[PDB]
């Protein structure tokens, strides 16, 4: 609470939206941290692991796996309110590709992740953008050593609601996973309906469980998975009366998966739309 109110912090979002300077400090910021090492996404053996040859964890944040190949395309990213005891955690990751499905699920099942997030459709306009992971009802699917069914799928206008139960086939242990899909954001935009995209955060924010990871993963694990985070950040300082910087927590994200947030359109929008939580938490 430390620089100004949050009442302050609104007051000026609001003025420099309509100035223009929070989009041009916006695209001063850094896109990829210097300094951070990336070295391991770029081995031969792991470069058709990466969806998008450029985007590339760092290795310090990675996801590991265990075993001979440890790597996936995954990034932890932890946005810490620190004024509240609090930490939302998030795996970000790309879309699997019809060979990673196997390590998405390992991630999974290692550390007993209960939710999903994702926030692209499989295609677009022709264009490849994430593997079917998840079998259809009433099919099943086998990946790395894990059985996958569909116990449920409900679809609403903007997403859809999946039940997943995921099998170690060796042991006989289950694990079920709540799945979430939002359909209605293209990919490098905002989305179709911003009163759709608030609910649809809500209902994310109601399924986090405590020091859980959330994870969360569009196609290329950075743009739209970065306005989600800045969002869920968002809600979490308005409701306890502690300042917003939107630059700040894209920032504290980039320090953890580069590129976050990608385009000045997809900023402007999730500025707009903290500005909208907070004037509807006045009421
Ligand atoms: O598939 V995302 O381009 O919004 O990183």
């Given amino acids: 609470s430390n ?5 302050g912090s609104m ?14 400090q916006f695209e001063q910021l850094y896109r990829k941290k210097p300094g951070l090492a990336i070295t391991f996404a770029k081995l031969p ?3 058709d692991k990466n969806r998008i040859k450029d985007v590339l964890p760092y290795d310090t944040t990675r996801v590991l796996l265990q075993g001979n190949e440890d ?12 004024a509240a005891n609090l930490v939302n955690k998030y795996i970000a990751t790309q879309g699997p590709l019809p060979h990673t499905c196997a390590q998405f699920w390992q991630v999974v099942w290692d550390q007993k992740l209960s939710l999903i997030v994702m926030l692209t459709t499989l295609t677009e306009r022709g264009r490849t953008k994430c593997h079917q992971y998840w079998p259809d009802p009433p099919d099943v699917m086998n990946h790395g050593g894990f059985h996958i ?18 099998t ?14 939002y359909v209605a954001w293209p990919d490098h935009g905002v989305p179709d309906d911003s009163s759709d995209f608030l609910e649809f955060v809500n209902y994310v924010r109601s399924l986090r469980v ?7 993963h569009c196609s290329a694990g950075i743009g739209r998975t970065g306005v989600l985070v800045t969002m869920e950040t968002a809600m979490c300082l308005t409701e306890r009366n502690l300042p917003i910087y939107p630059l700040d927590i894209v920032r504290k994200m980039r320090d953890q998966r580069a590129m976050m947030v990608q385009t000045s359109s997809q900023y402007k929008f999730v500025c707009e739309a903290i500005l909208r939580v907070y004037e509807e938490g006045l009421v």
């Fill in 45 to 47: 053996q792991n470069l």
């Fill in 71 to 82: 790597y996936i395309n995954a990034s932890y990213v932890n946005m810490e309110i620190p």
């Fill in 210 to 216: 405590d020091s859980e990871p959330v994870l969360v």
């Fill in 168 to 181: 170690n086939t060796q042991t006989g242990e289950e694990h079920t996973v709540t799945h979430l899909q």
């Fill in 149 to 166: 069914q569909c116990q449920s799928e409900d679809c609403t206008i903007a997403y859809v609601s999946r039940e997943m139960l995921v």
């Fill in 11 to 24: 007051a000026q979002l609001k003025k420099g939206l309509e100035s223009g300077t929070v989009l041009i």
């Fill in 3 to 7: 620089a100004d109110t949050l009442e």
